Amino acid sequence: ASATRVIQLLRNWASGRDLQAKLQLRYQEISKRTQPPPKLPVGPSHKLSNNYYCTR
């Protein structure tokens, strides 16, 4: 947050809490909007043998 030190002190005293530790505006701490590809594993029924549907 681009806030002056005096204004930060005034708002901290007025609220009674330290605002800088828990800010309500998002910043660079959030994840990138471009992500690597996933792999997404398969479920338990993807076996090649001993997988007859009548048993599940």
């Binding site: 076996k47 090649l48 043998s49 001993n50």
Partner: protein, 215 residues
């Protein structure tokens, strides 16, 4: 069968008791044997029914090429019977009940021997290709499943598969066997089952070699 028809006049002339004198109970008479493959003297010979396989091979076929220790596997009753390794062929007899007990079946008493110098997977795949080329195509299990097994065995010969596919091929063979119009499907399923049962480590080794050299 031709042999069944041809032995009948001799049976009538000499009596059924004479014919039943040979062989064990429920396996009586004499049989024609065709020994072929990796033997010094491949040949056709008529001999008493319940002869030991090793004794027949040594006495009439001249022994296994390179000696008895050189033996790798035997197909005892034609291409439709599962293979057996040396440990089974050591002390097995040649008749219906004893060969069924060895999980093979007497079949047509056509002995095809293979020494330790032959690709057993290649031989089984060639047999499966024969069965693919010989199915009449009437019923779907034989037609589609034998085509499928032929493709899978062709991939197996190179190791292009994964170890999990061995059990899948076994299940495919079971799905073919007992579900077809005639016994050609059974005769194609049994050699695959025998090859898996007696040489799964070789198939896995081939798969590992292919994966290693293909990465």
């Amino acid at each position: 069968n031709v042999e069944t028809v041809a032995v009948s006049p001799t049976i009538c002339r000499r009596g059924g008791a004479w014919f039943a004198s040979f062989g064990r109970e429920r396996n009586s008479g004499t049989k024609l044997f065709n020994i072929s493959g990796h033997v010094n003297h491949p040949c056709t010979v008529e001999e008493e029914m319940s002869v030991p396989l090793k004794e027949l091979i040594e006495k009439h076929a001249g022994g296994v090429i390179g000696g008895w220790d050189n033996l790798l596997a035997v197909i005892p009753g034609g291409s439709s019977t599962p293979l057996i390794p040396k440990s089974v062929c050591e002390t097995v007899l040649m008749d219906f009940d004893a060969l069924v007990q060895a999980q093979t079946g007497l079949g047509t008493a056509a002995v095809i021997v293979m020494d330790r110098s032959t690709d057993i997977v290649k031989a089984i795949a060639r047999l499966i290709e024969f069965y693919k080329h010989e199915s009449c195509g009437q019923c779907t299990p034989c037609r589609e499943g034998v085509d499928w097994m032929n493709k899978v065995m062709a991939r197996f010969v190179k190791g292009d598969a994964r170890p999990a596919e061995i059990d899948s091929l076994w299940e495919i063979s079971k799905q073919i066997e007992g579900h077809t119009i005639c016994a050609l499907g059974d005769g194609a399923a049994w050699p695959v089952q025998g090859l898996i049962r007696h040489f799964r480590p070789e198939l896995e080794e081939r798969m590992q070699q292919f994966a290693l050299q293909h990465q």
